[PDB]
Amino acid sequence: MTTDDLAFDQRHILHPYTSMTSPLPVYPVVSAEGCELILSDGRRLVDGMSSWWAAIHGYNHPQLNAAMKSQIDAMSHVMFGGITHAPAIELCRKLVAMTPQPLECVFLADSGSVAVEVAMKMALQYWQAKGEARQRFLTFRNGYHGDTFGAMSVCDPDNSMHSLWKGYLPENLFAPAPQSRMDGEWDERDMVGFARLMAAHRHEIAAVIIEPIVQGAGGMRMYHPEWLKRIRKICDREGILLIADEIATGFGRTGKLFACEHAEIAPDILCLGKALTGGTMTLSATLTTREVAETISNGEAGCFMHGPTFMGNPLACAAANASLAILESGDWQQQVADIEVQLREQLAPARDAEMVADVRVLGAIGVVETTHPVNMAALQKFFVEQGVWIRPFGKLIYLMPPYIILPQQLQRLTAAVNRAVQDETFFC
Amino acid sequence: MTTDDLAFDQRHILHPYTSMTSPLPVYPVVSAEGCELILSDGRRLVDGMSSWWAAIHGYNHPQLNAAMKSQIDAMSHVMFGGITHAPAIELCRKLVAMTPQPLECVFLADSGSVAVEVAMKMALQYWQAKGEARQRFLTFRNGYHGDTFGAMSVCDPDNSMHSLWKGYLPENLFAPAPQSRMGEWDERDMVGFARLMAAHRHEIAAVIIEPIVQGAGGMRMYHPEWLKRIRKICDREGILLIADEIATGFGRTGKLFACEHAEIAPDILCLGKALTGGTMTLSATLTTREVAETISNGEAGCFMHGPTFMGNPLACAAANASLAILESGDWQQQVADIEVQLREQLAPARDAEMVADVRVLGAIGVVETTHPVNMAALQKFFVEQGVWIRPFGKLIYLMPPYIILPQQLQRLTAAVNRAVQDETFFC
């Protein structure tokens, strides 16, 4: 990788949520292995991000590699219309067995935003089949569910700048962000806003959608499990469907296999992604109940009306199967728990830094919330120079390392976080 | 795959656009090679579908396989936020170079539906940045652009059953399906389109269409003059033109991009399917410097999109290998030869009672029938003839890999001709 490569990139390749006219530097990566990224210049970095939550087994995992390669020898891809195959059957068997019992129908898809679009269409069609007029969704502020239009319609109107689409996006219902903390106690006052919205609109709501326990892209917030317990019952009483978006939280990140387990509730529709494939390639899954799946098929349409070109991709299903096989060992329960204790201990000192507003930790997620926004170009350069890959965002400096990270590797991460927030050098 | 494996699939796995209650037979595929699918019981089938148009180089292609395994050795995936890599860079150089000049900025994403959503968002943000109140899209009837909410809002309201979402989908503008065939041009065809453009030109963010071929909405093949006329109309009104070539891209209609038939360049280009040689999902939406900068110079400060797996190294490497195969140029004659054989071998369907029309363009052969095909029965019959062909609605069509052999293509067409004789397989 030459500097002409980097110039081409800067001038012709869009990157996620980043200006094409006022660019910040990007770092060229050549390879990766275990918990390290390897830059083109040979510099090796400890990954604190898991490539956005997904690489829970790290990079170049032998089990993942061998499974992907074996699938390539049989067939990387074949269409899923009128056809089925072992990787898909194998993955759906595991998905069904590992999630709440009522969740037993699987619709595989390409991306997380699409899995959400799928969950929403399922809710709309479900009610359209029962002859009811339910077309609205009830969600929480600070929620994020994807960038496609449907998903955008249930994201925080602020964070996602809904003023850009005012008039195009449908107007859904936004209860206040849950206030009670996962580190703290329950407050019954938290529920007034949500309760108010439900009473006023209980009749037009097709479903409730939320991220269980951790609201990610919307502030890395961690709220009280009592919330899910409540929402599940309200939904049960009103006959409304519950959509849980575990695209970020699925597969052990929060300390439990699925974050819904923190409340011991099961949703009607469950969306998975990211760690599903061990972060090797995009794949998503939306699981639902027999009740939902059958109802839709008996309506006008005759079928749930969705079907992406690469649905069921054998290659990605094989990787996902290998990723779940690793998790079947159970070794993750202990890795995540130990990561939890080290993040609590080693980030605790940050609370005393001037620039810091809050330190919070759950499973393999450690968050340092600051008072002012980070200077991206500057803080990123600093992290790289310490030999770590940490990608902060706004006022959040956070870690979500692979579950196989070594204590020494984790310590490099937390020490770099602690040092970054010691002064205002890297702020504004 | 045991019988219990198949039982599980049927009861627990949702398949595309198909019922969970009256589910219809699926066939268990164990592997694939060349232009053939291989079932669990060893039966071999000539693929007439290219896995929904994507596998233009067939299956288990050594050049595609090697590029994939090699990229796996380096890293199948790494995030694209603040990071870049070679597969993405190399793929982007090819896309920019192979497309019309103005298209020089690439937004990679995961799937076709998403690529269309990206194109729509680019248009909305573009106009938001120029302070213009423009939120309508102008599209054609019989068009199909995907399954996500934004994409649905520009699909044919009848074919896509818009009544189901009536009230959720934004109301867009739908000009008449283009009548002139790919055939003689009739100026009267433009009346609909013009009537919508005049009354709404002040409102319209972009015109979106599939060039030359409207696939899923009916395999319709229209006259290139439309593209010429729409491009000029868009230039005049300062409206953006979005060309969805997710199905037409990479050689399918006889040219690299269907837009060439009219020698036109859109403002935004959507690509997918054949992009990776049908090995795994990936998409790209290309646009101009004007669009890309305007957006970044607006209030949001950047284009507001960024999926987790954006720029996936593995997919990018596969796509690089797919584009390299095309670089050899061989597809040019492969497709022309297929076109010839399809025209010749499907011509006899014009004597069959069940047939309404036979039309062909590049590696697309269509036998539109007089009545609703019975997909399950016909599917079984095709499997028994040793071929894979998936009908729908009133179309029995073929879109084979570019490398299909003459005797293999002969099977598909013979089966098609045999199928339509006979009332058996219909309604």
Ligand SMILES: Cc1ncc(COP(=O)(O)O)c(CNC2C=CC(CC[C@H](N)C(=O)O)C=C2)c1O
């Ligand atoms: C022109 C065009 N634009 C967008 C998309 C969406 O791409 P995805 O990758 O999101 O799907 C497509 C996809 N086209 C389709 C091709 C075939 C089928 C199936 C039709 C029929 N019901 C059958 O099963 O045989 C559906 C969509 C596209 O073409």
Ligand SMILES: NC1C=CC(CC[C@H](N)C(=O)O)C=C1
């Ligand atoms: N669901 C997600 C959406 C966006 C991201 C990226 C968020 C932030 N813009 C960042 O760059 O880290 C991560 C997850």
Ligand code: NA
């Ligand atoms: Na289950």
Ligand code: NA
């Ligand atoms: Na170009």
